[PDB]
Amino acid sequence: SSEELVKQLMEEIKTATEDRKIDQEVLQMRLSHLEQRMVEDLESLSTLQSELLEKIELLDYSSSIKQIGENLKVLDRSLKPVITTVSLMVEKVDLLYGKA
Amino acid sequence: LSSEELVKQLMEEIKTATEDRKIDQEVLQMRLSHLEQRMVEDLESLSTLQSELLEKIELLDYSSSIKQIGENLKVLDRSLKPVITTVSLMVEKVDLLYG
Amino acid sequence: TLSSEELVKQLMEEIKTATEDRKIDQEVLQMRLSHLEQRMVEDLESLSTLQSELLEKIELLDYSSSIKQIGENLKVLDRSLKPVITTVSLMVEKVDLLYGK
Amino acid sequence: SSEELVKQLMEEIKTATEDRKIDQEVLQMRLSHLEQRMVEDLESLSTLQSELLEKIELLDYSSSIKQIGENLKVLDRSLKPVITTVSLMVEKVDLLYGKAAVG
């Protein structure tokens, strides 16, 4: 019963090492689940992030707005000569109208 | 200092250490599950925010307003120098008729 | 030179030093997960903030009205010019006919 | 078969201890893989977000759109007299055209 206490105990360590074997199964099951959920979800986020990027570059109107701006400055330029050419016609027409 | 008493001491040392290791394992299982639940909670939030960025950014669509302005700017261009030039011609033609 | 009783006692001091060291080793594996959770919590918090700060910035970059106005003002300036263009248009038809004779 | 039992038990404990030592090393190894994957993925999201913060600044036309609004108002104000002036002048051309047209 000292030699039967060693008997029982060698069965406990056999028992406990079987338990530990399953305990380590469950652990791998939770680890893998986290790793797989991390790529499903940290990945999913990256898609949308990049889908947003697409639309940000599809709503770049810097070129259209630079151009509108520049076309408006051409008109505003041609105002100078226009007023000049009109003012010379006014006196010309004023002269014919006084000497008709 | 018996043998049957000293095997029993070692029996309870091992029994304890086995109880300890089990707990350690259940602690680790809980911490892994907690981390995964927290990560999911916090990503679902970010994931929602990013969908409302996808919509909200359509506020920055001006494609149509911008085409209409490009065209009205052509209309203005035809409304100025080409008109004056025909007027200057016209005044030239009247001027001769009075000669 | 190995009494059964003496091998047991040696096994108990052995096991005792292994149960202490097993303890420290497990506390480190535990705190590895606490450290990673925190790291993840902090970085996702920062992400979330920027996301909100981006949302506020999109609202500060809506010049949709300010563009519609320029769109309209410009329609108004063009409409303001049709009457004079018509007048010139008619006078030119009349003058060119007389000049061509 | 007292000392030879202890010596057998000791061997069972040795194989149990060393199996555990390895399971710990295997766990430490998956944890390092987890730590490195998590950090690499979070650094990517943080990279891609700060690239987002920059691209969106390209849609800040405020400076341009003020200048457009400004340059238009000028033109619109600067044209009001030019319409008036050409309208009076074209009426006078009319009155001159009438006489030239009968004579």
Author numbering:
A (entry chain A): 72 to 171
B (entry chain B): 71 to 169
C (entry chain C): 70 to 170
D (entry chain D): 72 to 174
What do the study authors state?
It self-associates in oligomers through a central oligomerisation domain (POD) and bridges the RdRp and the nucleocapsid. Here, we used X-ray diffusion and diffraction experiments to provide a complete structural analysis of BoDV-1 P. We observed that P possesses a modular architecture, consisting of a central oligomerisation domain (POD) surrounded by two disordered regions, similar to other Mononegavirales Ps. Using X-ray diffusion and diffraction experiments, we revealed that BoDV-1 P adopts a long coiled-coil α-helical structure split into two parts by an original β-strand twist motif, which is highly conserved across the members of whole Orthobornavirus genus and may regulate viral replication.
Crystals were obtained for the POD of munia bornavirus 1 (MuBV-1; 77% sequence identity with BoDV-1) and Gaboon viper virus 1 (GaVV-1; 41 and 43% sequence identity with BoDV-1 and MuBV-1, respectively). The structure of MuBV-1 POD was solved by molecular replacement using BoDV-1 POD as a starting model, whereas GaVV-1 POD was obtained de novo using Se-Met derivative crystals. For both MuBV-1 and GaVV-1, the asymmetric units contained a tetrameric POD, whereas the tetramer for BoDV-1 could be obtained after applying the inherent symmetry operations of the tetragonal space group. MuBV-1 and GaVV-1 POD presented similar architectures composed of two α-helical coiled-coils (the monomers being parallel) linked by a kink. Globally, the only differences concern the relative spatial position of the two coiled-coils, due to the inherent flexibility induced by such a break and the crystal packing. MuBV-1 and GaVV-1 breaks were also composed of three residues, with a strictly conserved aspartate in the middle. The Ramachandran analysis showed that all of them fall into the β-area, with neighbouring residues at intermediate positions; this confirms that this specificity is conserved in all Orthobornavirus P. Using the Vc determination on the diffusion data, the MW were estimated between 40 and 45 kDa, 12–16% lower than the theoretical values, all corresponding to tetramers. The three X-ray structures fit perfectly with the SAXS data.
